[PDB]
Amino acid sequence: IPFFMTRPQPTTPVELVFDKDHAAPKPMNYRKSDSLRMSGSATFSPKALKEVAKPVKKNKASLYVFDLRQESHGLINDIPVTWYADRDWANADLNHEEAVRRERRLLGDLRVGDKIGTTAIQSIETEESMIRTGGHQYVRLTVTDHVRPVDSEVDRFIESVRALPENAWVHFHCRAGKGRTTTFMVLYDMLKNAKTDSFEEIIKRNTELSNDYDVLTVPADEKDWKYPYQKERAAFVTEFYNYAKAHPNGEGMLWGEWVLR
Ligand SMILES: [Mg+2]
Ligand SMILES: [Mg+2]
């Protein structure tokens, strides 16, 4: 597999968007695997954190929330917000550190007292703050919606997985809870189970669990803008299976090293 270099141009205008459906006390597109001790959802509110934490609840520290979002986001008046541009490609030119810095900068540019339409800002919070206040752990990856992760972010993921305590529970989310979230549930499952389970079985159980049946499907139309991105994602997950089979739980070699053999 090649070293992965292609990417989209970032989109504009970027606008702060209040994600009102994500403000509900239950997380959207939620699903879980008790055997893998993993779950996935859309980005969620302060009140929904207790729901996400249920499978762990008497062991708060063992929940690790993996935020997969490249685009910037946070909480204003407990409402999840996104700095949105088309396809959530606002930050598509930024590497991980740049994307993390950009989100800090945009949240810092908000002020208590600002009026954005009918909203008067009274509370500004990072998502990490909200997660950690609940006694849980937080890991940020930066993945572009519709695009596979870059190799170094896959390594970042693996390094985080290798450092997990026994009996960690991992919860993935992205803005919609489909696409990126499903892919990393697949990658996590392969890290643990590629050594014993088939590629097709792993894809099958995760598409079914996530009601995300076209996560890896390549459009029939080659002029559909998603076509090259889906081809890339498919190649990536197909080779990741081979890596994870050879290096269960990332033992002995990271993905990045594997690619550059
Ligand atoms: Mg709050
Ligand atoms: Mg640059």
Residue numbers in the entry: 33 to 293
Sentences from the paper on this structure:
The B. bacteriovorus open reading frame Bd1204 is predicted to encode a PTP of unknown function. Bd1204 does not display catalytic activity against some common protein tyrosine phosphatase substrates but is highly specific for hydrolysis of phosphomonoester bonds of inositol hexakisphosphate. Phytases are a group of enzymes that catalyze the release of orthophosphate from Inositol hexakisphosphate (InsP6).
Bd1204 crystallizes with two copies of the protein in the asymmetric unit. The peptide chain conformations are extremely similar with an RMSD for Cα atoms of 0.31 Å. Bd1204 adopts a canonical PTPLP fold with a central 5 stranded mixed β-sheet of topology β2/β3/β10/β4/β9. The central sheet is flanked by 2 α-helices on one side and a 5 helix bundle on the opposite side. Importantly, the β-hairpin at the top of the phytase domain between β7 and β8 has a large deletion in Bd1204 that results in the partial β-barrel that is present in both PhyAmm and PhyAsr adopting a much more open conformation. Additionally, a Ω-loop between β2 and β3 that is present in both PhyAsr and PhyAmm is absent in Bd1204. The deletion of this loop results in a significantly shallower active site in Bd1204 relative to PhyAsr, (depth of 7.7 Å versus 14.9 Å, respectively). Examination of the catalytic motifs reveals that the general acid loop (D177H178) and the P-loop (HC206RAGKGRT) adopt the same conformation in Bd1204 as that observed in PhyAsr and PhyAmm, indicative of a conserved catalytic mechanism.
